[PDB]
Structure 1
Amino acid sequence: SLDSRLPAFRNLSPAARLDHIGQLLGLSHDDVSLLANAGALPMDIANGMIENVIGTFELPYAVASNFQINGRDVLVPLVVEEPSIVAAASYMAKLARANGGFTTSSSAPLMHAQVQIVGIQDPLNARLSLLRRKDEIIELANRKDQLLNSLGGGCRDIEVHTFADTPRGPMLVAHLIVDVRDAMGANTVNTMAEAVAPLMEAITGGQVRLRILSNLADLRLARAQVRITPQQLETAEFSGEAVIEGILDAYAFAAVDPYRAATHNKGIMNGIDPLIVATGNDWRAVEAGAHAYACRSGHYGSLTTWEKDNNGHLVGTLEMPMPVGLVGGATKTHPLAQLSLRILGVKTAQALAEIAVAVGLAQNLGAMRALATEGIQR
């Protein structure tokens, strides 16, 4: 029943904003006081989180309004230093509301862990010997996380890739494919990969080197859609139809020119990374998966798509890797990460991922709209 529209929110005091947020969600007094006074992350907690700590560092904590995800209103916390991001997110979310809001979907929460093996005289043969015994390897990985498996996750499969031409000789690389449920999953699959490497070595006869997740998490994709009508985009100087054509022009620019794509995709992360930070997740992992995926073709291109549908409406998509957690890393440890998660209402990590790509799509739309409607000076 949540209403995320938040009229005049942009003009209230932070206290009145905090007040209003707590009314809508039924936030407890303990929850509200986490943001009412500075220092919600005690030094006892901060000193255990990273090394050589001498203090804490604040960034603003904001809430984007209007977002609606498969028909459900959602409030979006965001932590960033740069102006205009929150406004643009909120305004595009407001336009998206009229045409159904954002529509999202996602894959299962699957992470790859790589096991690199050098020194094999017959790596292509060894690959088949490895695959043939994958159940044994899968069983071995799952012994190290009885908890994960009890919750419906765990190692599901193995794939093997080979690299014949390398300055350091031929390389075999096994991928454990692991359902990590509500975790982002890095430590989980790293333990699994370290655990299975000796059996793998025994089968293939090489020497194991790296045992490590891949951040190109292309089995953990999240998807968002948005639709905008010409009427919604009409400005003083341009018809709504001309604005749509200009947005498509800017999109094709990003699609052919990496100099533009880098900036175009930067605007997307302007919307995603602040949500990642606000929920205590690793934003370097999200950035690396985002940009590596944008050039999987060998050409660094745009993560979003923008089209005109058969009705003349502007339709955008965002599909990308989105590894995030509700548990693990620092997401349980930072009190405000827990509060961010309560504000969002998410019950699985994949639901958080779908919100992330919705916000990234909205940020890109706001960026391109502003750039396309800016008249030429004279």
Structure 2
Amino acid sequence: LDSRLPAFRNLSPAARLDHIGQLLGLSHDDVSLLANAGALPMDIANGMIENVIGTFELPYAVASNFQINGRDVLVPLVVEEPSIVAAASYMAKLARANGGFTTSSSAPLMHAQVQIVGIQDPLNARLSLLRRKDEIIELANRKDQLLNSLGGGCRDIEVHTFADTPRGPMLVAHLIVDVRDAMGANTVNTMAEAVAPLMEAITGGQVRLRILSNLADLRLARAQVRITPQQLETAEFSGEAVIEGILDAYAFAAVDPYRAATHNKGIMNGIDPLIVATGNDWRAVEAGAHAYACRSGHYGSLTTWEKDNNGHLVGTLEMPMPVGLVGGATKTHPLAQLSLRILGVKTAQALAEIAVAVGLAQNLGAMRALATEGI
């Protein structure tokens, strides 16, 4: 597959669609889903949320030049803002010359929180739970036998305590669950809620909230990119000068939350559109991203930018990225299914890796422009 779409930005929507169908070998029916308005039937729409009275459209585009771990990939994006798709495509083009984007990710692990509250001895109760963790882990898994046969399931449990709160001492158990190709919400909420009774028996307290945590710091995705000075040379500045300017911009975001917020927003300009295109939950992705950005106590930059021993500009992006290939709109929306088809992803983590590659490219594009704009 060749993701380099020469003059793509100049072709009409119909010609672009036609092209894409050729390169990927899409069927007639497939192409029809995009060539005609209304791919989301009302009976499906009406079943997705409540009080439905119609549908709302947003442009559906494809970013070009992406390469992940040596393989070309086409990226669908749904958003209303200008310059996003173009910036992503351009930066991806420059990345190709140096190997493209290199990515990796952890197992798809999600947290399931179980809050406990009228315990006179929360600290002691915590060791009682840890003592019987295997028992708890087995109860959570037999709950769902199919997931375990697919390679997932509850892998462990952690317990934290907050003995000093205005409502008193609280004990919070975390089930660590491998959710496979799903986002994780229902799977995880379901186990938390099967284990609640046993935890009450062990601790003697009262279980309150049983719910997942959107701060998915155990489900990380990572991307790297490299750019040389020769590729950033403008008619006004040398490539070396531009790189120095980009490093200044990064340092600025690392120390000032007012810039970091804007800096990180640019990253989500690239990621959210891919989430929407695949029918995934963008509020979940946004919460995990920004909460992770301030885990140290200071709200900073999700990406990093440096200059290697060769003077080359190198950036990274590591962040929580919970997404699914199954569940909700990802399965019921005809276009969400087509997007996955166009992407060619076989696992949820593969989609997560593409997401951060796009976020990284978007961040780079924004800084390059901000740093090259004449006064």
TM-score norm. by structure 2 comes to 1.00
- Structure 1: runs of 5+ lacking an equivalent: none
- Report Cα offsets for 1:147-177 as digits up to 9, x if no partner: 2111011111000011111000001000000
Per-residue deviation, 1:145: 1.9
Q: Can you list the C-alpha shifts for 1:47-90, whole angstroms capped at 9, x where unaligned?
A: 11100100010000000000000000000000000000000000
Matched length: 375
Question: Distance in 2 between the 1:319 and 1:329 partners?
Answer: 26
**Displacement after TM superposition at 1:322 (Å):** 0.1
| 1:13 equivalent in structure 2 | 12
Out of 259-268 and 128-137, give the one that drifted further.
Answer: 128-137
1:97-246 map, 5 Å? 97-246=96-245
- How far does residue 143 in structure 1 lie from its aligned partner after superposition? 2.2
Distance in 1 (alpha carbons) for counterparts of 2:328 and 2:317: 26
- Distance, in Å, in 2 between the alignment partners of 1:138 and 1:329 is 27
The separation in 2 between residues aligned to 1:14 and 1:144, in whole angstroms, is: 49
Deviation digits for residues 285-326 of structure 1 (CA, Å, limit 9, x no counterpart): 000000000000010000000000000000000000000000
TM-score (norm 1): 0.99
For 2:189, what is the secondary structure of its paired residue? Answer: helix
Question: 1:214-250 deviations in whole A, cap 9, x for unaligned?
Answer: 0000000000000000000000100000000000000
Shift of 1:112: 0.2
Provide the secondary structure at the position in 1 that maps to 2:331: coil
SS at match of 2:59: strand
What SS class does the counterpart of residue 22 from structure 1 fall into?
A: helix
Identity percentage of aligned residues: 100
Shift of 1:342: 0.4
**Which string of whole-angstrom CA distances, capped at 9 and with x for unpartnered residues, describes residues 331-375 of structure 1?**
111110000000000000000000000000000000000000000
Measured in 2, the distance between the counterparts of 1:20 and 1:56 equals 28
Q: Which runs of 4+ in 1 moved over 2 A?
A: none
User: What CA distance in whole angstroms lies between the structure 2 residues aligned with 1:60 and 1:124?
Assistant: 53
Deviations 1:117-146 (A, max 9, x none): 001111111111101111111111112222
In the other structure, the counterpart of 1:348 is: 347
Gaps of 5+ in 2: none
| In structure 2, C-alpha distance between the alignment counterparts of 1:222 and 1:102, rounded to whole Å | 13
| CA–CA separation in structure 1 for the residues paired with 2:8 and 2:142 | 50
* Matched position secondary structure for 2:143: coil
C-alpha separation between the residues in 2 aligned to 1:145 and 1:137? Answer: 13
Q: Distance in 2 between matches of 1:349 and 1:16?
A: 31
- Per-residue Cα deviation, 1:260-292 (whole angstroms, up to 9, x for no partner): 000000000000000000000000000000000
Whole-angstrom CA distance in 1 between matches of 2:47 and 2:192: 26
Distance 2:143 2:56 in 1: 36
1:329 Cα deviation (Å)? 2.1
The aligned runs of 1:240-259 (5 Å cut-off) are 240-259=239-258
Equivalent positions of 1:51-66 (< 5 A) are: 51-66=50-65
Between 1:141-150 and 1:346-355, the stretch displaced more is 141-150
CA distance in 2 between partners of 1:287 and 1:271 (Å): 12
- C-alpha distance in 2 between matches for 1:132 and 1:71: 47
Distance 1:233 1:262 in 2: 25
| RMSD value, Cα | 0.5
Partner of 2:309: 310
CA distance in 2, matches of 1:312, 1:139: 53
Q: Distance in 1 between matches of 2:321 and 2:80?
A: 22
